[PDB]
């Protein structure tokens, strides 16, 4: 698995690989990584796929949850916070092998300057968190590929797109050195997921977009 | 036995009868929750979950306890089994049951009047469901509008006249606060389960919005 | 105590009193229920398992606690033993005894009246069974047809009358329909019947233009 | 206190009193059971145990709880010990306890009155024994007949004047029949079942149908 | 407090007294327990421990409990002990608290009125103790005999006229039945049993049918 | 142990041995696994004696409990379900050592087919239950003998007599090539218990009428 | 064991192979390994059969419970869940050797295209679930096989009698390649078991359907 | 330990020796391992001494526990059951090394036949228990010496006495092959101990009968 995840003047690119494995055996291609857990939030799991996807809903309802109980959602250090313990209490399963760690990434309504709005945090099996000032961070079994890829890409990024396509790209990478990261599948035409977040909330980047940004990337590589 | 019944259900009747009224009534686009409320940030209409709204009369920290206990209700159906499953007849039901306990069980009765409205998932044809649970338990199935709090009948008439199937928005919510004045921005409550949004379909409408739909043609 | 149990027992039987009828017959095909209900939404009649249905008088709130205890009941004893061993006379034996702890334990007691019925399973040949059970856990056992709530004394008399085993479900219809009067269109009624035919699961509803045809 | 007693013995009495009445005789094969009774299937006689019946009236929901604690009783200490263990003495003793406590704690009395019989172990001579078991957990050792439920003592002269021992099944049905009406009748209205002693392991058999019929006439 | 007490004492007493009764004495042999009862197989008259034997008048489901927690008392302290250390004054002490409290703390107390004795261990030299625990916890120690049950004036009256110590089985049994009519007597209406001191360990045996009726003449 | 049992023309046939052991030491002669658990069933069962008796009677008290609290008995799917529920309840224990595994057969009184109403249910250690179509089916130590000397046998069964045979012989077999089952002791008169059951219920076959059987099996093989 | 399922134009179908193991002995030649739970699901379980069978009793019992509390039925996504949360419960049993998988069949009344309202979807011991989105998939110790043969037949799934020979035939290849994969018995008259499900419902297909289709696979395999 | 017991027409004897050991130390020479536990029946223990003792006496307690309470004994049967119910209580500890097995003697009252009415049962250290229809057993360290010998002097048995001349002789055989279990001690005097029950109830064996058909089989085997 390889989950991306970085900052753009005014929004955070969340992105993630299809790939499911069972050992050395493809188990699963269209599979998705990175939901939208909230207006202005999206979770991308590496992992357990059964841990994986009871994070990420139960996280969901949480916060809704929340918003509905108190009339106002969380504030993005409670949402953190959230998260943080959720990790922390699965980890007795996770010592014995039912391990998921999440990427967050979302826009905080309430930061003051709306162009570093955009907030990217990581997660450790004990739910120790770290609030990436650097712009870019990844998680999985090809995190160091993608995040290696993105150090030396990161300087290109201006706009959403721009990030949108150094997402694609260091999952490329990632795909290219990590066997357990499934990269661009032009055959069956299936491509990584991604979620974009501005102040106008998260929305799924449509396929198409991707499928030409994976194609730009294969092309200029030949 | 008898008695004591009795004497639970006029309190609970004449402590309903002293509250602030609310309507709720179907229009075109959904279902529109009007409230009478000066308060600026204690709230007697709210979500319940994606679909789905209440509205309720009647002593604040009793239905406010009913309104978390239904969130959690509905939160926890929808993660046991998916979010589509959760239905306003669900909620109303538990309502239902809740109520008949609290009723029969505890210290004092709930002074409180409740409405469970539901409307269609996006893209999906269903007329709303409007519910009315009192506070013994009492369940009633509407198809156009809900009166709870204060004096009913003169607002029920009222609209019982000026009610016509798929409203307008602002024709319904001029209807709406007619019938209860039978009253501004700063005095009203209101919000709408709005069917033509994707997935929560719950708005609420305050302040320069709202006063712009209370005066626009 | 006299008069507490005095009470109690004028509370629900003034409770069910004022409540709408239902009524269950046996006709030539199985068992029908029918009821006044004016709601689109809320059901008095329901499925229990494969051959046994339920209905229901008085405050719905309570008969529907009373229903989904049936429901747990029933599911569990199927799994536990075999979907066969549940029968009518299990149901109603189980809302006796849980109607007499209420009607003496609850705080208030239950403004409710029971009807469990229970069909032949598939290509059987077994006569219907009809129990009702009232809000002191009383259990009788009916041959032909029950009525509950409401003012029963004209819809049984108009039962002992116009009833006649072995009918169709027209004509079973049109009786429950008049039997109910002594006391209706599409719009004011819930019609089920547990259906003998069925293979597995008999309980069927009849509903919206399918109901208005056979009136 | 002494009123509350008093009411709760009055309520239950009216109760039984209300009730349809319930008849158990020793006669030549064993003990026999009739109950006035319009159900198909709702019982008011029940086996217990292996050569222990039971027989009772008043309001079905609580002498049927009565009935399956009885069950669940015999058929433990049977499991703990020995099926021979099991006797009637211990079931009525364990009656008279449990609805003695019913009785003092319970929310309302239980409108019934029980009746536990025994009959020898196949191969063994020993009579009959029968007990009842009032509403307040009282127990009486009857050496006969017992009667229960409705106006019982029309159903009891009855009895003295006509009684034998030594009667055959048929006999002693109709005996109990005519008892029966003496105090306010056929197949679609009665149940009746026997414990038999001649039976090798279970005593307990019902009677029911064309058999009953052709035991009440000729 | 004082209405609940008295009720509670009028309650058992007039229990009782509707009971039939019951006789222990102290005789030659050990203690003789002669008890009214028509029934062929319901006791009232029991087996405590080795050298221990009870009796009861009242309600048979309500001393039928206090006998079965005497035995259960006693076999756990001989076990736990020894058998030698279960004494008649502990059983008697137990019974004292155990009445006083259902006497009490109990929905209804118990009609039940009880002997507790004990005889002197195989070849030993000791006087039979008799005590007498009442509805209420009251515990008296008796020398001679205990009557309890019905009306028991007449029944001690004719003890006092008639009894002597050591009598003979044959004599004891006789002053026994005749105080016992004074409040037609033969083996089908008596229970009969004896705490014989000349038994090796237990003491406790019923007499019946031949054996009775041969003492009876 | 070898258990035995087989469907016949009209009725089931249940049949096993008599000994009993403690490592290589014969601790018991005459013991007995074949129990009428009702009046239309039986069991038979192979394991730790402790266990395997406890499981006869309490199943059967089982049984009974539930006809005398419902009036009615249980049907035969009923009846396996208990067993089964029963064999799984003592799993744990079963992992330690004293595991006990039965076989159940008897006549649905409610099967539309009178001859072919039989039933025969084999049970694994957790519970797991199979119907047997084939006709027969042993447990225990031989059960392996024994059912192939029915595979070969089981043509001949065409009564209660043919299947009482066939049964006999069968542990006759598993005794031969097994040290753990007993076969028939014509020294202590000493043979397998078998039980028949049919319409009329489930009888206990007399002594007698076996031991006819093996020493016509014996005198067979010389 | 092996379990297939595969979407077909309009409906699914899953069947199942007979044979039941204790190590290399064969236990059992009729065994049922699918079974319709809900009027529009089967489920087909590969593991130990004690357990197999609970997840698949119990299985519809919830669903039928739910049925009949709630007046209707779960969506698909709702059955999905609950058999998830039930394999996830028996966790701790799995890893002591009392391991069971499913696989999930089923027709969903409210997608928006009929033609495409079929739904398979696979287990881990986990709980975790997936959609299978290319139309077939396996489950058991044969699985691989049969998965591998179907990747090569599918394009020749056009209704549902292709589809349910292919099905058919994929277990034909599990029980060619796996010994605990019992293939068709024309001895005894033995033959996988398979339900079809479309908007009418789930039935069973009747044993003789099957048997003609695995002659013809043989024949076909023989010259 | 060994202790015996035997069938003889109208009873049964069970007889027991008196050593203690604490590995091959001797700790005790005059110890009681068969015991009285009812009018009609005798209990023998060998194992772990604190158990042993302690399953007598619980054993004795909770018979006449039942006596009382319900007014008349237990059935044998009933006897049998709570015997095996107490010994599988204590499966834990005894697989902690508290083991103990006991030997259970009786007469049935209730028996058709009272030449027959003798009872021997063995158990097991998780409660299986076998009545023992050839007439001996024994149990201990020394029970397969014991049970080889009855086996060879049993033909013998036609009345009590000749029951406990056996009975002893078997004892003595099994002190000859087992250092646990202790022969008769002539210079102190020490013996086993035997309880006979017959139709009359069970009965200590008198010291000195004992003693005389110790040395007649000591004085037999030496000439
Ligand atoms: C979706 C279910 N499925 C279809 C049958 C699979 O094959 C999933 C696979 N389960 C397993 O490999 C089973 C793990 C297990 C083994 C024994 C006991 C308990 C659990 C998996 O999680 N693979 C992981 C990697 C892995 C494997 C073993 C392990 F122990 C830990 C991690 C993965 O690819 N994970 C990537 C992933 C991330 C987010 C959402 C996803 C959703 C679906 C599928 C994959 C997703
Ligand atoms: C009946 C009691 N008895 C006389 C004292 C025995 O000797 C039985 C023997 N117990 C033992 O071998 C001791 C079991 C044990 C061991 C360690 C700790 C705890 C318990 C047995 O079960 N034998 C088994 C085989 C066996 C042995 C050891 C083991 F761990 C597992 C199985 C057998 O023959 N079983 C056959 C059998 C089947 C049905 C009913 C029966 C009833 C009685 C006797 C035998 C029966
Ligand atoms: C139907 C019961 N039966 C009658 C005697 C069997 O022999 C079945 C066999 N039991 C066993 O192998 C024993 C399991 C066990 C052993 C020790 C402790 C606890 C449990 C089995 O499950 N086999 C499995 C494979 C297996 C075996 C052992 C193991 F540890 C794990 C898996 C199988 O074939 N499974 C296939 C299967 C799938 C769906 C429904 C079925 C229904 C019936 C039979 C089989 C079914
Ligand atoms: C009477 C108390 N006593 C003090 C002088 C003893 O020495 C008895 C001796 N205790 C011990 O050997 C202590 C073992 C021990 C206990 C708990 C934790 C750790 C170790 C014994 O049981 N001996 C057994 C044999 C044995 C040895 C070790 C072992 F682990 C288990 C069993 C025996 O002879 N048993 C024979 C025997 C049978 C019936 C009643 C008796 C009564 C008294 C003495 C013996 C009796």
Chains 1, 6 share one sequence.
Not at chain 1, 204 to 215: G, N, Q, Y
Not at chain 2, 48 to 76: P, S
Not at chain 2, 92 to 103: E, H, K, P, R, S
Not at chain 2, 114 to 131: D, F, I, N, S
Request: with cysteine.
């Amino acid at each position: 698995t390889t989950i991306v995840a970085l900052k753009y003047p005014g929004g955070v690119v969340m992105a993630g690989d299809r790939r499911s494995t069972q050992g050395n055996m493809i188990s699963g291609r269209d599979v998705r990584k990175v939901y939208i857990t909230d207006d202005y939030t999206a979770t991308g799991i590496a992992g357990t796929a059964a841990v994986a996807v009871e994070f990420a809903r139960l996280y969901a309802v949480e916060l809704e949850h929340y918003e509905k109980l108190e009339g106002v959602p969380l504030t993005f250090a409670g949402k953190i916070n959230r998260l943080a313990i959720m990790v922390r209490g699965n980890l007795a399963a996770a010592m014995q092998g039912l391990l998921a760690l999440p990427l967050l990434a979302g826009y905080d309504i309430h930061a003051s300057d709306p162009q570093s709005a955009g907030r990217i945090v990581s997660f450790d099996a004990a739910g120790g968190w770290n609030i990436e000032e650097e712009g870019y961070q990844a998680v999985g079994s090809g995190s160091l590929f993608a995040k290696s890829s993105m150090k030396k890409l990161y300087s290109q990024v201006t706009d959403g797109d721009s990030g949108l396509r150094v997402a694609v790209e260091a999952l490329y990478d990632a795909a290219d050195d990590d066997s357990a990261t499934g990269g661009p599948d032009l055959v069956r035409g299936i491509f990584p997921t991604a979620v974009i977040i501005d102040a106008d909330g998260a929305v799924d980047v449509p396929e198409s977009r991707i499928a030409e940004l994976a194609r730009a990337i294969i092309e200029s590589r030949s | 036995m008898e008695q004591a019944m009795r004497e639970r259900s006029e309190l609970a009747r004449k402590g309903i009868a002293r509250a602030k009224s609310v309507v709720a009534l179907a229009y075109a686009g959904g279902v529109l929750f009007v409230a009478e409320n000066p308060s600026r940030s204690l709230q007697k209409i709210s979500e319940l979950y994606d679909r789905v709204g209440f509205a309720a009369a009647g002593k604040f920290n009793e239905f406010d306890n009913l309104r978390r206990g239904g969130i959690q209700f509905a939160d926890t159906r929808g993660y046991a089994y998916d979010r589509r499953d959760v239905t306003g007849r669900q909620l109303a039901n538990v309502y239902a049951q809740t109520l008949g306990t609290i009723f029969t069980e505890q210290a004092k009765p709930y002074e409180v009047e409740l409405c469970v409205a539901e409307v269609a998932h996006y893209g999906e044809t269903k007329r709303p469901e409007l519910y009315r649970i009192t506070y013994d338990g009492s369940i009633a199935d509407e198809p156009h509008f809900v009166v709870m709090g204060g004096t009913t009948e003169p607002i029920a008439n009222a609209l019982k006249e000026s009610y016509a199937e798929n409203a307008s928005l602002t024709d319904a919510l001029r209807i709406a606060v007619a019938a209860l004045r039978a009253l501004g921005v700063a005095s009203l409550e209101v919000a709408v389960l709005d069917a033509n949004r994707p997935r929560r379909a719950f708005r609420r409408i305050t302040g320069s919005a709202l006063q712009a739909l209370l005066v626009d043609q």
